[PDB]
Amino acid sequence: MKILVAVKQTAALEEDFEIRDGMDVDEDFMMYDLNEWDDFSLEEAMKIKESSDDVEVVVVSVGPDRVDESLRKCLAKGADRAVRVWDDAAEGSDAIVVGRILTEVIKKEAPDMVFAGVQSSDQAYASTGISVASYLNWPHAAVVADLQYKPGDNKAVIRRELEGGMLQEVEINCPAVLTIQLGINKPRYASLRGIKQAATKPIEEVSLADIGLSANDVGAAQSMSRVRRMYIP
C-alpha cells in the first residue's frame, strides 16, 4: 500500500521586494520553504500509515535542486521516500502542466491514494491537485477537512469544508485524488535527531525521459495562460 503526497516548495518575498523586464519579482528577494498545506497532507498520510499494518508514504515534487531542502523536511516529518522530478525545460510550467508531470511520475509509482494541498501559499492557483485527477482519470474531491479511509478499502468518506464553515459528507471511490485543507489534523515537528537522520537519506532524482515526457510537453510554452506583467498594486 502506498500514499503519494505531492508537495511544493513555495516562494515568500522579503519587504520591500522589487519587480525585475516586468515579468516577475527579482529572485534576490525570494525565500523558499515547504508549502503550508503540504504539512497537513503529509500528516494525514502519516496518520493512515500509523493506524494499521504497512504503508509507504512517498513525497514528490516538481522543481529544481533547491526543492531538495523542502523534500528533506518531509523526510524529517515522516515520509518514507522523497522523489524530485526536473529538467530545466520545465521552468514556467503552469498548474496544468505540473499536473501532467505529476501524473506521469504517479503512474511510475502506482499508489493507492494521491494527496495534494488545496492551494499553494505563493500562487494560490487552487488547481494543481485537481488537474492531476483529470489526467489520471481518478475520482476526486477538493477542500477535504476530514478523511475516513483504511488502506486497501474501495471507498473513503470525506468532509468538504464549504463557505461559512459548513461541512458536506461525501463518499468517494478509491483510488482517489484528494486536496487537503488547513486544520484537518495537527502536523508534527521533527526533533533535531529526526532531522539529522533525514539528512542521510537519498532524494531520488527523476527526469522527464524517465516518465515519458520531453521538452515539448512542459514549460511556459505549453501553459494555459501567459504572464504579460507583474506589478505592485
Binding site: 515568500a12 520591500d16 525565500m31 495537527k186 515537528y189 526533533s191 533535531l192 535527531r193 529526526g194 532531522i195 539529522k196
Partner: protein
C-alpha cells in the same frame, strides 16, 4: 521602507542656540546611576544616541547637598568630581551626534537629605506630604538669593561638563513649582499671593541661569502645568497658561507634565490606568499660548500617534522616558521603516519601582539590557555571533524561554523552542487578561513577532506549539547539544505562604469551594457569591482578582497577612488601585492571616 508620513518626525527643530536633529527627545529620567555610576549613565544614554534620539538627558540633578535625595539616587553636580563623572556621558552622547541635557534639581522638603543631613529651604515651612518626617526652613530674602546662586553655579558646572541643554526643573512639585503653588507657598511678601509674585522665584531663576549659560546652552524648563488635584493646586487654564506666557521669553523649550510628587503615576501613567496620549488634554494647552517649541510626554511609542500630535499643533517634539528605556532604538527603527522591530513599553512601571525602593539600578520588563549595557557589555541590538553549529532545545515559551530563544537565534544558534501552550507567552497570557492589563500582552507580542521573523532567517531553527508535554526521555533523545528548561511556576494549592512556609490545614484548590489564580483566570470553575481572597503576596495578583471578581458581581473580602499591594506603591499604581477597590466595595482585612480552612468557613487571626 519608512512611511512618508513619518518624515515629519525626522525634521530638525531649533531650540535657542542648539538644533535638535529630529523630533525624538529623551526627557530627564532616573535610571539608578546619577553621577555615582558614570559607566551606566554613559552607556545607557549613548546607546539611545546611537539609536537616533536627538537629545538625551540625565535624571534629576541636585544643585547642592541640601537637596540630597538619599535614600533615593539622583544625579549630582555639586563639584568638579561630578563634572568629570557626567562628562563621560556628554562625550559619549556627542559621539553619536545627539545633544546632552541636565535637569537642575532642588527638592525643598521633598528631599529627605539622609546622606548630607543638611536642612532644606522652601517658600514656607511644611512637612513634605511624600517624605512625612522631612521639614524645610522658610526662606528669607537672602536664602532665596543663595538658592538662586546654587542654580547659577550648577548651570556653569553643567556647561563645563559639556551639556547642551540646561533645565530649571519645576515639575513633580519641586522648588520652583513650590513657590508657584499656594498648596506650599503661604508667603505674604513679594514672593507670595498674586500669580506675578508666586512666579517671581522661577522667573528670576530662569533669568539668572539664561544669563550665566544661555549663549552656550539651550535653557529648557519642565513644568507641571496642572497638578491634577482640582482647585487648590495648579490648574492649566488658571495659573498654568498664564505662567507659560510670563516665562515664554526666557525659555528655549517647554517640557510639560501633569501631577505632583506623591502621586506621580499621574505623569508616568501605568497602562493599568492610562493609554498612550493620556496627557494630551492638558499638554496641548501650552501651545495655545507659547511661541516656543513644546513637548509633553504621554507614553508615546506609535509613530501614527506621534505625527498626530505634531500635525495638529499640540506639540513640536515627541518627549519620551519609558518608550526610550523599552527601546533605545525606537527612532532608528521608525527611520528605517522597521516597525515590527519596535519593542513597545508595557507601562508596568517596574523601571520606576527600582528607583522608588531607593538605591537599586533600574531594570526593564521589555528590555533585559537596560542597566546592563555598561556592566555586562550587553548592547540591545548587537549580539556576539556563535562560531559553532551547536543546537539548543528550549522547553517552555514564557517570558524566560521566549527571551532565551530570541537572543540565541539573533546570535546565530540553531534553536528548537517547544511548549504545550497554543501561543507564546506562558503565564503572561492569563495575566494580561486581568482587568486593565491588556497592554502587558505586548511583551509576548514582541517575542512572537520576533521569533517568527528570526525563523525565516535562521532556517534550522523551529517553533513548536500546542505540543504534548516534553518528558525526560523526550529531552534526552531530542538531539540538541544544550537544553534550557523554562517550565515556569504555579500558584500554591495548599496554603503554603511566606509567613509560616507550610501548608494551611484545610487548604486545597481541588475542592469545589476553593480556587487558585489560574482557576479564576481560566473561568471554568464556578464561583459563589461571597468571595474571600486569602493573600500573602504583595504585588498585583490579589488586588487584580478582587477587581475582576467584584466587577463580575461578587461580594469580595481580602484577608491579607502582608501589606496588600505594597509593591504597587513602587510602580505608582497604588493610589488609583485603592480608589478602584473602594468604588467597587471590596472589603480589606489587613494584619490577619488564616490558621485553618473548612467547607465554607475559615479561621483567621490578628498577626499582632
Amino acid at each position: 521602507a519608512r512611511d512618508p508620513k513619518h518624515d515629519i518626525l525626522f525634521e530638525p527643530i531649533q531650540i535657542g542656540p542648539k538644533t535638535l536633529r529630529n523630533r525624538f527627545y529623551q526627557v530627564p529620567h532616573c535610571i539608578g546611576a546619577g553621577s555615582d555610576k558614570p559607566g551606566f549613565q554613559s552607556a545607557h544614554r549613548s546607546v539611545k544616541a546611537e539609536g537616533g534620539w536627538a537629545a538625551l538627558n540625565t535624571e534629576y540633578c541636585s544643585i547642592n547637598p541640601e537637596s540630597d535625595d538619599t535614600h533615593r539616587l539622583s544625579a549630582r553636580i555639586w563639584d568638579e568630581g561630578d563634572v568629570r563623572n557626567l562628562k563621560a556621558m556628554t562625550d559619549e552622547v556627542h559621539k553619536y551626534g545627539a545633544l546632552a541635557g541636565v535637569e537642575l534639581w532642588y527638592g525643598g522638603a521633598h528631599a529627605p537629605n539622609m546622606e548630607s543631613r543638611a536642612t532644606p529651604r522652601g517658600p514656607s515651612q511644611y512637612a513634605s506630604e511624600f517624605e512625612t518626617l522631612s521639614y524645610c526652613k522658610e526662606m528669607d530674602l537672602s536664602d532665596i538669593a543663595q538658592v538662586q546662586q546654587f542654580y547659577v553655579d550648577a548651570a556653569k558646572r553643567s556647561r563645563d561638563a559639556g551639556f547642551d541643554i540646561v533645565y530649571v526643573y519645576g515639575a513633580h512639585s519641586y522648588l520652583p513649582l513650590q513657590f508657584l503653588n499656594p498648596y506650599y507657598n503661604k508667603r505674604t511678601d513679594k514672593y507670595g499671593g498674586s500669580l506675578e509674585n508666586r512666579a517671581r522665584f522661577w522667573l528670576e531663576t530662569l533669568e539668572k541661569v539664561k544669563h550665566a549659560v544661555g549663549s552656550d546652552c539651550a535653557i529648557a524648563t519642565r513644568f507641571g502645568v496642572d497638578t491634577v488635584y482640582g482647585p487648590g493646586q495648579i490648574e492649566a487654564e488658571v495659573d498654568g497658561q498664564k505662567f507659560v506666557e510670563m516665562a515664554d521669553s526666557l525659555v528655549d523649550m517647554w517640557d510639560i507634565t501633569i501631577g505632583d510628587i506623591a502621586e506621580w503615576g499621574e505623569d508616568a501613567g501605568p497602562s493599568r490606568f492610562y493609554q498612550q496620549g493620556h496627557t494630551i488634554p492638558w499638554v496641548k494647552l501650552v501651545k495655545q499660548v507659547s511661541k516656543k517649541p513644546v513637548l509633553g510626554v504621554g507614553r508615546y511609542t506609535d509613530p501614527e500617534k506621534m505625527i498626530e500630535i505634531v500635525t495638529k499643533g499640540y506639540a513640536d517634539i515627541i518627549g519620551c522616558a519609558r518608550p526610550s528605556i523599552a527601546d533605545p532604538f525606537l527612532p532608528q527603527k521608525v527611520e528605517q521603516g522597521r516597525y515590527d522591530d519596535i519593542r513597545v513599553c508595557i507601562g508596568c512601571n517596574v523601571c520606576i519601582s527600582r528607583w522608588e525602593i531607593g538605591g537599586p539600578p533600574m531594570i526593564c520588563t521589555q528590555n533585559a539590557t537596560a542597566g546592563e549595557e555598561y556592566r555586562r557589555g550587553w548592547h540591545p541590538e548587537k549580539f556576539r555571533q556563535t562560531k559553532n553549529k551547536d543546537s539548543v532545545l528550549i522547553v517552555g515559551a514564557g517570558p524566560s524561554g521566549s527571551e532565551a530563544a530570541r537572543v540565541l537565534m539573533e546570535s546565530g544558534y540553531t534553536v528548537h523552542l517547544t511548549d504545550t501552550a497554543e501561543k507564546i507567552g506562558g503565564h503572561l497570557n492569563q495575566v494580561a487578561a486581568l482587568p486593565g492589563l491588556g497592554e502587558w500582552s505586548y511583551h509576548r507580542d514582541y517575542r512572537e513577532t520576533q521569533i517568527t521573523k528570526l525563523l525565516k532567517k535562521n532556517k534550522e531553527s523551529q517553533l513548536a506549539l500546542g505540543q504534548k508535554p516534553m518528558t525526560a526521555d523526550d529531552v534526552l533523545q531530542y538531539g540538541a547539544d544544550k537544553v534550557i528548561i523554562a517550565t515556569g511556576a504555579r500558584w500554591n494549592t495548599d496554603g503554603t505562604n511566606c509567613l509560616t512556609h507550610d501548608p494551611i490545614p484545610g487548604a486545597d484548590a481541588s475542592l469545589p469551594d476553593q480556587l487558585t489564580p489560574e482557576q479564576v483566570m481560566d473561568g471554568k470553575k464556578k464561583i459563589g457569591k461571597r468571595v474571600v481572597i486569602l493573600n500573602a503576596d504583595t504585588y498585583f495578583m490579589a488586588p487584580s482578582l478582587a477587581e475582576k471578581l467584584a466587577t463580575a458581581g461578587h461580594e469580595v473580602t481580602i484577608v491579607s497577612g502582608v501589606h496588600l499591594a505594597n509593591y504597587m506603591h513602587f510602580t505608582l499604581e497604588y493610589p488609583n488601585m485603592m480608589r478602584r477597590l473602594h468604588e467597587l466595595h471590596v472589603e480589606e482585612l489587613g494584619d490577619h492571616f488564616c490558621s485553618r480552612i473548612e467547607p465554607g468557613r475559615m479561621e483567621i487571626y490578628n498577626i499582632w
